[PDB]
Design a protein around this nucleic acid. Structure first.
Lengths: 244, 211, 121, 147
RNA sequence: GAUGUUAGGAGGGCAAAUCCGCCGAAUUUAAGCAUAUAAUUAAGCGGAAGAAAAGAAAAUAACUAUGAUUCCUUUAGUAACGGCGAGUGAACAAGGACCAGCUCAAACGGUUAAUCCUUCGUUUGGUGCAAACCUUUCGACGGAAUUGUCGUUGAAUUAUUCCAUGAAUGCCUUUAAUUUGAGCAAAGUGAGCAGGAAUGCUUCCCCAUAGAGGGUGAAAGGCCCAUAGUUCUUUUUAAUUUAUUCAUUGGAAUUUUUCAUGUCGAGUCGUGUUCUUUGAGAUUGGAGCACUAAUACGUGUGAUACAUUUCACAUAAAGCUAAAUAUAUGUAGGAGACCGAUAGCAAACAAGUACCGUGAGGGAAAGAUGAAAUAGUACUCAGGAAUGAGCAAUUAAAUAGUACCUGAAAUCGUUAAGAUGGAACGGAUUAAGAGAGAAAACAAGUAAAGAGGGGAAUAUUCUCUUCUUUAUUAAAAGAAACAUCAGUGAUU
RNA sequence: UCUUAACCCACUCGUCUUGAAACACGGACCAAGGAGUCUAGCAAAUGUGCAAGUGUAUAUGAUUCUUUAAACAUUUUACGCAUAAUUAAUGUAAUAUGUCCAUUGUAGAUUUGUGCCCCACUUUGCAUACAAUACCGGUAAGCAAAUGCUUUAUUGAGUACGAG
RNA sequence: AUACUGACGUGCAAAUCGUUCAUUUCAAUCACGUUUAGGGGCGAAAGACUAAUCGAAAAGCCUAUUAGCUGGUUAUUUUCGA
RNA sequence: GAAAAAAUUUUUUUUUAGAAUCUUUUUAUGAGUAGAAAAUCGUGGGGUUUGUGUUGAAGCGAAAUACGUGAGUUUUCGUGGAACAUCUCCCUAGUGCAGAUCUUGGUGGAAGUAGCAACUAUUCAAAUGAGAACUUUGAAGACUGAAGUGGAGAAGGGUUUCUUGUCAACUGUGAUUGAACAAGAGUUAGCCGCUCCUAAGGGAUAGCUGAAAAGUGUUUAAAGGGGUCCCCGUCUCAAAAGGGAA
RNA sequence: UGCUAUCUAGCGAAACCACAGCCAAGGGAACGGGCUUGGCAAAAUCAGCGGGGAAAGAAGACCCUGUUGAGCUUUACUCUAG
RNA sequence: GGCCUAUCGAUCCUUUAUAUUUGCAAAAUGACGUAAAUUACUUACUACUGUGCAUAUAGAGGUGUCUGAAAAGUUACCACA
RNA sequence: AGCACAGUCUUAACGAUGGAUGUCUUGGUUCCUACAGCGAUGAAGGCCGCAGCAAAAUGCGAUACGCAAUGAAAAUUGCAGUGACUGAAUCAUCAGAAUGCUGAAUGUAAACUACACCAAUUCCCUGGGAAUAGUGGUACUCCUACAGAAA
């Protein structure tokens, strides 16, 4: 609050009064009289720098960097080792770029969605997601932060035919539409890669978006995939190689 | 103040805490404007809510080659189109008295623009099923069939937007048509030098004419 | 969840629970219906009434069926026939039961309830 | 942000990392730019040479539109075409490009650099340097003054 | 012009966050201070609204020109002002949001002020249960009004085309939204274990378009409210559907052709002079005083005083008007990487309360039993009474007993142990006591025979084991002691 | 581990101060609170993306609308800073067409060769340092009718294939 | 309210006590009502007094005024160090 | 990429390294205020990850053959009765105290001490009660000494009055007392006052000023009354001690 | 001689307080309770007392310092009602 | 410039010098000059083009507390750091 | 039925004292969203009241912790009472009805229940019969209308 702790009267008789010289509340009778006043050390006195409404709250993150972060995060999800490393129970999955026929986009009952995840072989992961809801420690409970859950698979879809409502309400699942792929969802907590489930339509559309066989509005205009600094990172093969 | 660093210059010296405002409202305010305007368009019987505007050339030296939406077609442009101001106003063509067509090209270009909009539009009969020729040069009413089929069609709003100037700088000329004896720089400086004397003569002509 | 109209913030909800008026309080003293009745009426849950017969299935009396004595909307407590207990001074009072801890069997119809049962149907 | 700050590194040390002996007092020279010409004169001489006093003609409203005029050197002129077009002109002698300097938003053409010897070029612009006219002419091109 | 308790009406005060007029400082900055600065701020006083103010060119430009107002983005820390110090500081364009225009006055209309208003009345409706509202034309009788209301917006006139119009019969359908209140609302109160009591642990079941939030005797998707989802009903306002006949009065727009070329805000603008104010500089705006104009070929702008003059752009000295735009106030919602009872609103409590001050005013402290007090201390004994005790007694728990959660430290009690010749503790090293401990600080395996657990082979063979016991062999580990080296020394 | 001992040692901490154990000041005790922050604008450092550009502004657009007050998107010259400087200023403005070549030195990294590896020759000649020339704006001086001229002086926060 | 520079001086009191003393028909004393208000009032004048507050009252605000000056200015190890 | 030991050639036991800000090894070196840096460590919250909880969480008290140079970290037993971590990585901050004559709340030694001293001074017996130097009663002895601790009254206080209870706290000793606490109760006017009148004066009306707020009080009044169309003529408050029906 | 002081019964504070409390000399910020060297040093207490504790009070009022003030004066500088 | 070693002064401002250098913000002011031209809103071509103010450059007017505030006393009535 | 010196100091266990710590949280907070003026038709504000047993806080206004009406709808309870078998008890809604004295406060006043002046006023009954010293009105300024006075 703007005036916080300063709406007492202000007075300072102290020199020669045989007390410390910091301000005292004036007047008499009541216990608040003669008592230590405003200041960053006294009962009700207000902390030294208040927090204003005008902290530099946000940040203007840069378009080209954001795009690169999205491309790179999706690419990271592509690599099997990284998803496993990110801690998914992904052991029995057939392939990490997991693409399913567009009938997945038309799924429309939660049980079938669970059943589908089990059929894929993510049973252990589905178990961890159901299991992992807990009440967390500390002040959060009073601020509407009661449960903590861990991050489930990310369903990527081309256009709704049930999926958006249908896979929601299974703990820790996320859904996002392909055109508006989201860096926070692809890369939670600054971790890299995620267990991703793609529609075939989505998969085909992804390639269109970044400009192989470009389009008038789907493709991001004037934008290219960032070229790598290193062309091939197999350092041990280079060292192994005969000439070297 | 200390060493190499530039001199300080911050004008927060007169009381400024009582004068900040921080816009957390950007996205929500944008959403609100959109929602009201969309609601208004929905309300207004499927009509566009945008009004026609003339294209104009920008003021002064700085933007002499650029062209933008102005405010208000002028009386000459309406008359050339075949409309009268109140009538124009009813069909969303916006008027003014202030503009005056200084040069020929701008008048022709604007009457073509008005005509294109006019030719495009199709008019609802005012009291339903009572279609008539109508006043002021406003396009005549239409039947049920045309209207019904047209309402079902998408209303293409391209005319409201600013005209793109098509770039044509990458252009070609034959070498043997080039005239190499010209001195452009010389002409320019001489013209600047001779300006006062030319003004002096022009002023004398202007005096002569007025009598 | 999805509507923004109803607040989901904890403090506010809690306040609402404690400061609730009597009609609202009557509504949230509702009980699970027994299976035969559930089948009969096609209804999950009912607001409790005095002359009905409940079965207790949570708390230290979970073997007990019995008739409802008094319902207390001030204290959020229903009281039942033989869940008697002696107090310190040798005086018998009834043990309070909260509605979740009872499953309602036989319920006595009257015109107000009949209207509710038809409304549910 | 806060966790990295310098004061936490020195956190228990009496001066707060700001000198025991002289201590950090409020406003220790006087405010802002005050000490100029007098007690901080040496700083003002040594870091902002020309600072004090007035010089030259006054101008009552600049009205900056009038005098606007971005420059380009001739050096960059062929670069305003794409690559494929440039090659085509290099191959075919009979035609030359016109370049309208207005469309790319420049007003005056200046004379840095070397043009390709014996490609004529027609240059349309508002302003030219003396040097630029001579160079454009030297390669067999023409200058057209245009508003 | 007075006068009237004449008839009908109005203003006063409260509320201020945003909003509009005034009036108006200083602390301060300049390392002093006097001009500047603080600041056209604060205080003072007047006035409005759901927003206000501003607004329909006496504008800017000098271009290929723009074109009411406001706001945003911007120009710009720039032009500029300034002990040219400190410091201060615009405008035009440009990109947007929004986008809306107008009427008095002046002119014109006298074979007739065509206006306006109170009071009395009078009727075509529609809603509503009623109350009541809401439409509706038509007359009186007063007044008011020529010291100027009303119409018209140069004037007729041609062709074209519209809009009000009034009567008859007919016809008010389907949908789409939008916004209120409304309902209805998925699966387990299944074993066993430990617990006072699961929502715990297993395990066997399930639902989810609901695994948001809350309640419930410990963490509950399936115990409950609610939630997702829909089904209605409410607000208005789109689209869609049907009009058809007949009727006359009146008005409007272009278009021809004529003829008329009219008007345009004065003690005001301006100027001098002052003072103020400003970005405004031989004056930016205001203001006082003195002087005091011109009629549209006028007179006002075109940021340096002037003359003699072009040219561009405008039409002052009268009025109104939606939008965007603002909101630390009041009230209602919704929120949170916010605070957690010495914090956070001063204020989680009977807080602007108690209390203090003659008064203006100043102005606190103080949340938590337990699942349940519909468990709040029964009974006996000793007590005058407080209280205490109990073989007695609520509770899972009273060393949870209404000072009721947890219960730190300072401080102080009881017992035990030690110390004790004018400070006390301490450091570095050992000692004697007093406690604690086996995880390195001995003993693998093997056999006998009990108790468990597993894994495999194709309910029973094989095989791996942990605990117990009897006894029965390893071995290693550290410390000693002497000896051998090697390294570093001393000695005779 | 604690506990006393014993030998030997051992001055009240904080503090301002040339110099504190001080006959300098502050400290009876204990518990909790209690002090280099935030914004604006600027700088260098370093990180990161892009690169003669760069930032997508305000704002629009989206089957984006619990989260989302964020994320996403932006039909082939808006604005900032950069891309050129200089002079009070009208303003003027970078070698120069003999050639897609890119001013001259002296050191100087990297490379080629000779007589897979040290040399010593040669060979290319970065960065950078030090100079030198040209040329551009201002000013001189000389001339002067002109697109002003000049081999000469000077001056600039100038330039000589970009760096932001 | 003079003297005792007496009592008290962590008081019986933020001016009290004892004894001594000045004053008493007038420039006399008291009550109550009434008048004058802060760079102001009032003053048989001490810068006295204006509610324990006076060489500029009390209250709140401008205001967290301002201070080249005093005090304070919070975990460890490691490196270089005036 | 195999080294050793143990058994009884064949079985068993130990180890078997490749983390680049990292591992092996070598050598040099090590003072520090003002100051700078790096590396750690800890607290509130966040995202991410994978866990502890009623066979008892956090907290707290005492510790521990515990680990760390150290900040600290870890753990045992006891208390406790409900939530707690995150070192995987990293965002974020009102983040770490002995001191400020710091603030707030509590608390000691000083200490059973200074002190409970004005106002002539009390004694005996009885009653009540658990208990009487200071409650009540009687008897003495005393003092105040009509400028009174006596009657009345004013201002201020405000139920303090009275009866009946009565003793949690207070009544600076004690206390059965009480101006405390509790329960009821009590104030009666034509004549006593206020109430009416005017005074020092106050507030308004007319004007006039002033942005207004206010400053003025007949200064250009068509103004409230009495007679019966004439004559008087600012309104209003201001005395509980002046005037004043009984 | 009264009343206090005193002892008892009863009741019951505070200022102050780095830690504390025997000296000589020495040195040392030049007058130490602690430090070095000497003298020396034996529980617990009771009543006085004023040698010392550079005793208490209280950000020296004297003096000086501040580009802190204020009251006051003038033929200080700048103003200003009248 | 004075035999050598001393003999002195920023910014703003004023003041007077200098120039074939410039400005006064939509324009003009020598000059309808010189040629033409026709009867006119004609075409070329000219270093030199009103008053006043301002700049640029160069001196000079002065700051002796001399690297530059326009500044007298008093307090035994006094305050505070 | 014996034995311990006391004091002072230290240590440990168990206590007092105290309320820190941790844990909670019907409160604050900030932002966002939304509407947004009350008054002579008597406001805000203040008093004064009002319960069977009742102090404040709350609520309400002489019909007084509530009346009516609508929607829920069987109990409400400390005692006492009052209620169903749905205008009865309880809520919610809240439009009807009611809203003391004041307060701009406006008949003159004000530390007053003081004081004027003009209407006497009100109710019942379907044009009569009863009540009650009770109840209204009466500020300043203004505007339109009207009135009878003046030039």
């Amino acid at each position: 609050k703007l005036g916080a702790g300063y709406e007492t009267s202000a007075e300072s008789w102290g020199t020669g009064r045989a007390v410390a010289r910091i301000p005292r509340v004036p007047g008499g009778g009541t216990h608040r009289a003669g008592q230590g006043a405003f200041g960053n050390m006294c009962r009700g006195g207000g902390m030294f720098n208040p927090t204003k409404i005008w902290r530099r709250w946000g940040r203007k993150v840069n378009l080209k960097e954001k795009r690169y972060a999205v491309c790179s995060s999706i690419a990271a999800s592509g690599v099997t080792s990284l998803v496993l490393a990110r801690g998914h129970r992904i052991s029995h999955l057939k392939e990490v770029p997991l693409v399913v026929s567009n009938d997945i986009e038309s799924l429309s009952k939660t049980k079938e969605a669970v059943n589908f995840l089990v059929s894929l072989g993510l049973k252990d992961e589905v178990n961890r997601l159901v299991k992992s809801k807990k009440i967390r420690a500390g002040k959060g409970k009073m601020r509407n932060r009661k449960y903590k859950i861990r991050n489930g698979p990310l369903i990527i879809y081309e256009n709704d035919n049930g999926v958006k409502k249908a896979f929601r309400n299974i703990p820790g699942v996320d859904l996002c539409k392909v055109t508006k792929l989201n860096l926070l969802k692809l890369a939670p907590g600054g971790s890299i890669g995620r267990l991703c489930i793609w529609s075939e339509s989505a998969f085909k559309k992804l390639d269109v978006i970044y400009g192989k066989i470009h389009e008038k509005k789907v493709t991001k205009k004037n934008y290219i995939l960032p070229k790598s600094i290193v062309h091939n990172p197999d350092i041990y093969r280079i060292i192994h190689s005969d000439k070297v | 103040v200390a060493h190499n660093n530039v001199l300080p210059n911050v004008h927060l010296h007169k009381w400024w805490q009582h004068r900040v405002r921080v816009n957390f409202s950007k996205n929500i305010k944008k959403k609100k404007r959109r929602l009201l305007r969309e609601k208004r368009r929905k309300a207004n019987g499927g009509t566009p809510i945008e009004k026609l505007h003339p294209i104009v050339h920008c003021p002064t030296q700085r933007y002499n080659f650029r062209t933008r939406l102005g405010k208000g077609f002028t009386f000459e442009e309406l008359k050339g189109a075949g409309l009268t101001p109140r009538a124009a106003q009813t069909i969303g063509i916006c008027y003014d008295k202030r503009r005056k067509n200084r040069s020929e090209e701008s008048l022709t270009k604007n009457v073509e623009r008005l005509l294109k909009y006019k030719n495009s539009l199709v008019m609802i009969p005012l009291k339903k099923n009572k279609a008539k020729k109508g006043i002021g040069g406003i396009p005549a009413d239409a039947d049920k069939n045309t209207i019904k089929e047209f309402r079902n069609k998408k209303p293409l709003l391209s005319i409201f937007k600013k005209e793109k100037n098509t770039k044509p700088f990458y252009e070609t000329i034959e070498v043997s048509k080039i005239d190499k004896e010209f001195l452009a720089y010389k002409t320019l400086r001489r013209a600047k030098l001779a300006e006062r004397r030319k003004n002096c003569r022009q002023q004398k002509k202007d005096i002569k004419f007025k009598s | 969840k999805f509507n923004k109209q109803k607040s989901s913030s904890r403090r506010k909800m809690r306040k609402a629970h404690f400061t609730a008026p009597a009609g609202l309080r009557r509504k949230i003293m509702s009980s699970k219906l027994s299976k035969e009745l559930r089948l009969k009426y096609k209804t999950r849950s009912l607001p409790v009434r005095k002359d009905d017969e409940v079965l207790i299935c949570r708390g230290h009396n979970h073997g007990r069926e019995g008739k409802v004595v008094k319902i207390n909307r001030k204290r959020y407590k229903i009281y039942v026939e033989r869940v008697t207990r002696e107090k310190v001074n040798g005086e018998s009072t009834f043990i309070g039961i909260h509605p979740s801890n009872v499953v309602l069997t036989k319920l006595k119809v009257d015109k107000n309830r009949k209207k509710i049962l038809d409304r549910k149907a | 942000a806060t966790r990295f700050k310098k004061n936490r590194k020195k956190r228990g040390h009496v001066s707060a990392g700001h000198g025991r002996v002289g201590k950090h007092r409020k406003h220790p020279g006087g405010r802002g730019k005050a000490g100029g010409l007098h007690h901080m004169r040496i700083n003002f001489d040594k870091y902002h040479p020309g600072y004090f006093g007035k010089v030259g003609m006054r101008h009552l409203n600049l009205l900056k539109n009038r005098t606007y005029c971005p420059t380009i050197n001739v050096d960059k002129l062929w670069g305003l075409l794409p690559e494929e077009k440039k090659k085509e002109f290099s191959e075919n002698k009979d035609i030359a490009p016109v370049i309208d300097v207005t469309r790319k938003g420049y007003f005056k053409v200046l004379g840095n650099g070397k043009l390709k010897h014996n490609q004529p070029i027609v240059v349309k612009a508002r302003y030219f340097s003396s040097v630029a006219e001579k160079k454009i002419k030297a390669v067999g091109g023409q200058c057209i003054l245009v508003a």
